[PDB]
């Protein structure tokens, strides 16, 4: 039990670090795609091509 719990905790810490790094990495391309996403959203809430 204790090894299972220790292994789970270690992998949880490692996964937290790795996934946090991966998320902020991908947020970079997120801020690129945001421009097009917002343009198309505007062209929807307006009902005509922006």
């Amino acid at each position: 039990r204790a090894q299972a719990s220790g292994e789970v905790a270690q992998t949880l810490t490692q996964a937290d670090q790795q996934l946090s790094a991966q998320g902020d990495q991908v947020r970079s391309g997120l801020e690129s795609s945001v421009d097009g996403l917002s343009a198309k959203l505007a062209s929807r809430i307006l009902g005509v091509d922006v």
Binding site: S33, L37, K40, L41, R44
Partner: protein
């Protein structure tokens, strides 16, 4: 990874459309204590879902010529005079599907466990009619609760409403969690006609207690077939009122699809309090203990959903295990009386028994299951037939345990048999027993094979024997679970194993049992 992320926001942007349609608007003319009165909405229907500007929701529960009294389902602090109220046009409905297994959901079906959204197969309104008399079937399939006391003396059959009634900290939630856990061996079978799906409606319970129940189910592996409809004490009275109905709807979707469901409610005493609060705030006339006139209708409408459907409707079932917290063990209070009348059986868990070491504290004799032997497998029925009479005689004779020197041989035999049967019905928490092991235990007790073991050791004996039979003579358990009866060919072998094991047992005082 990045492909998925924006994938979704982009998809929103696209599928998103400029909805523009007639809508009926009211205005909040009065708000307070979880109730908001809405002028307007002429087409509103009773128990309709209204949405207020801040994403808040409420239920149009009173309709007068002047205003609509709506109970606000949380986030009440964001309601103001003059805010627009927009009617959804649909009565309360909750999503339902197989995706709710392993999830914790608020009474509206929105997940609160922090995991992803739930793939809702369909929506069911919280007020659909219960199965009719013609759509039902006789309760005849056991629902093994794993508690020797319940399964032997107050059996629950699939489709029954077995109330668990007791004072605080007496073993109610423990009994229900043991019942939920005991269904894992049936779940792993993969046969829908044996699987029992569980819904644990938590009402007015502190968040950490629901988390503890979730951990208890998860460590025992029962979360993969259990859904928690959590309405913690922090939520408005509306959620504590609707949680039983959201659990009933989730269970009913499976019930009508042919699955078998077990619906637990800790506690209907807290749902009734929530409804009382809502009614008094809405100024509905109060009756006994300030409850509104239709509290019995509340609980009956909730519990009459539980039923076993005829084979024409798929043959599914929904078994209720309402939990009600009496005060000072006064089963005559209003809500306890109502539920005792509604339910098909009662398990009276008393604190005096709990302190005396009887756990799970079920007061045999007063606790009954009107379904009776029809909810037991043949083996359990045959073994436990004598159990109730023996325990009644023991409770009659217990005053004589002091002066047994002067008792008749038969009377002393009954006293000693009962003193060991009561130990036999004890059971540690989170340790449910499969039906075959219960059969073997009550067989030890009733046939008298425990009459030689000291009362102090029965619990250990029964354990060390069952384990032994599980390890070296698993044939008995296989026969019992496959045939549902304890035949003579297997009974003789079981007695032989009992006598073989009794030689190897060392009672706690050092004596020898043979």
């Amino acid at each position: 990874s990045a492909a998925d992320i924006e994938g979704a926001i982009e998809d929103y942007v696209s599928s998103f459309s400029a909805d523009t349609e007639r809508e009926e608007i009211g205005t909040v003319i009065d708000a307070g204590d979880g109730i908001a009165h809405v002028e307007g909405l002429p087409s509103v229907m009773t128990q309709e879902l209204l949405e207020f500007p801040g994403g808040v929701l409420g239920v149009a529960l009173n309709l007068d010529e002047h205003s609509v009294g709506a109970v606000i389902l949380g986030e009440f602090e964001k309601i103001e005079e003059g805010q627009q109220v927009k009617r959804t046009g649909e009565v309360l409905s909750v999503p339902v599907g197989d995706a709710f297994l392993g999830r914790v959901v608020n009474p509206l079906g929105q997940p609160i466990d922090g995991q992803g959204d739930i793939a809702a197969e369909t929506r069911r309104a919280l007020e659909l009619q219960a199965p009719s008399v013609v759509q039902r079937q006789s309760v005849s399939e056991p629902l093994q609760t794993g508690i020797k006391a319940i399964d032997a003396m107050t059996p629950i059959g699939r489709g029954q409403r077995q109330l668990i009634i007791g004072d605080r900290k007496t073993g109610k939630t423990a009994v229900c969690v043991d019942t939920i856990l005991n269904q894992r061996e049936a779940w792993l079978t993969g046969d829908p006609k044996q699987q029992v799906r569980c819904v644990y409606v938590a009402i007015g319970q502190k968040g950490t207690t629901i988390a503890s129940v979730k951990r208890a189910l998860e460590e025992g592996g029962a979360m993969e077939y259990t859904t928690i409809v959590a309405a913690p004490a922090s939520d408005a009275a509306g959620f504590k009122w609707l949680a039983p109905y959201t659990g009933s709807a989730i269970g009913q979707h499976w019930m009508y699809n042919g699955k078998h469901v077990l619906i637990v409610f800790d506690d209907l005493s807290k749902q009734a309090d929530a409804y009382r609060a809502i009614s008094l705030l809405l100024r509905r006339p109060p009756g006994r203990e300030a409850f509104p006139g239709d509290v019995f209708y509340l609980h009956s409408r909730l519990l009459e959903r539980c039923a076993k459907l005829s084979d024409e409707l798929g043959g599914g079932s929904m078994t209720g295990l309402p939990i009600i917290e009496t005060k000072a063990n006064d089963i005559s209070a209003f809500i306890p009386t109502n539920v005792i009348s509604i339910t098909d059986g009662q398990c009276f868990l008393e604190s005096d028994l709990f302190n005396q070491g009887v756990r799970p504290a079920i007061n045999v004799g007063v606790s009954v299951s009107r379904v009776g032997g029809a909810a037991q497998i043949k083996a359990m029925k045959e073994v436990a037939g004598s159990l109730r009479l023996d325990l009644s005689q023991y409770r009659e004779l217990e005053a004589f345990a002091a002066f047994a020197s002067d008792l008749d041989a038969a009377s002393k035999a009954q006293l000693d048999r009962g003193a060991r049967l009561v130990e036999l019905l004890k059971q540690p928490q989170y340790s449910p027993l499969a039906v075959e092991e219960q059969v073997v235990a009550i067989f030890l007790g009733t046939q008298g094979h425990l009459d030689s073991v000291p009362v102090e050791d029965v619990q250990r004996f029964e354990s060390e024997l069952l384990e032994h039979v599980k390890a070296s003579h698993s044939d008995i358990f296989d026969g019992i679970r496959e045939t549902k009866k304890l035949s003579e060919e297997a009974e003789e072998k079981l007695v032989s194993v009992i006598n073989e094991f009794k030689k190897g047992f060392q009672a706690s005082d050092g004596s020898s049992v043979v």
